[PDB]
Amino acid sequence: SVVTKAIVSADAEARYLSPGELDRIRGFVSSGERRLRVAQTLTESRERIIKQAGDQLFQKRPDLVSPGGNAYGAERTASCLRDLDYYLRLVTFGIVAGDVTPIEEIGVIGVKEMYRNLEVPLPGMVEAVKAMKSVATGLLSGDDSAEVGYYFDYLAGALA
């Protein structure tokens, strides 16, 4: 998180954290309460977000569920929705952390190799993530939508 980055930056120079870094951490802990409120809101709306996101993805990209598509079949569509659930959990982790570092460590490093081996189309990932972003931002207020959409934007850029 922000605290870990400040600590590792200070340790790189073999120094204590400067008053500026301490002030940055103070602002971070101040914003923590709103961050947990946002993450709680997205955690409560698990099944909704997954359901509308999957429906928009499958209507926008029928080929994925059609014969020959990567998600054809009940079990493969279930795995698709399971991946969506993974990424939504990662986005909640990013919201609490204040940065995209947990998303980066769990679901972004080596994702292209994983989906190459799985024969998962990356544009399908990008569209599913965009649909998740739309649903999540819709279920939120005007303020929360910006910071939540930032993480989905980072994730889609990582897939794209």
**Binding residues for other proteins (CB under 8 A):** 1, 3-4, 6-8, 10-17, 19, 22, 25-26, 28-30, 32-33, 36, 39-40, 43, 46, 86, 89, 92-93, 96-98, 101-102, 105-111, 113-114, 116-119, 149-150, 153-154, 156-157, 160
Tokens of 39: 């993450």
Q: How far apart are the first and last CA of the chain?
A: 24
159 binds ligand CYC (CB under 6 A): no
Q: At 35, is the secondary structure helix, strand, or coil?
A: helix
Q: Does residue 28 contact residue 2 with C-beta atoms inside 8 Å?
A: yes
Q: Alpha-carbon distance 79 to 92, whole Å?
A: 20
Q: Does residue 97 contact residue 29 with C-beta atoms inside 8 Å?
A: no
What would the x/- binding string for ligand CYC be over residues 79 to 118, using CB under 6 A? xx--xx-x-------------------xx------x---x
What would the x/- binding string for ligand CYC be over residues 37 to 66, using CB under 6 A? ---------------------------x--
> Minimum Å distance from CB 56 to ligand CYC?
11
Q: Does residue 152 contact residue 118 with C-beta atoms inside 8 Å?
A: no
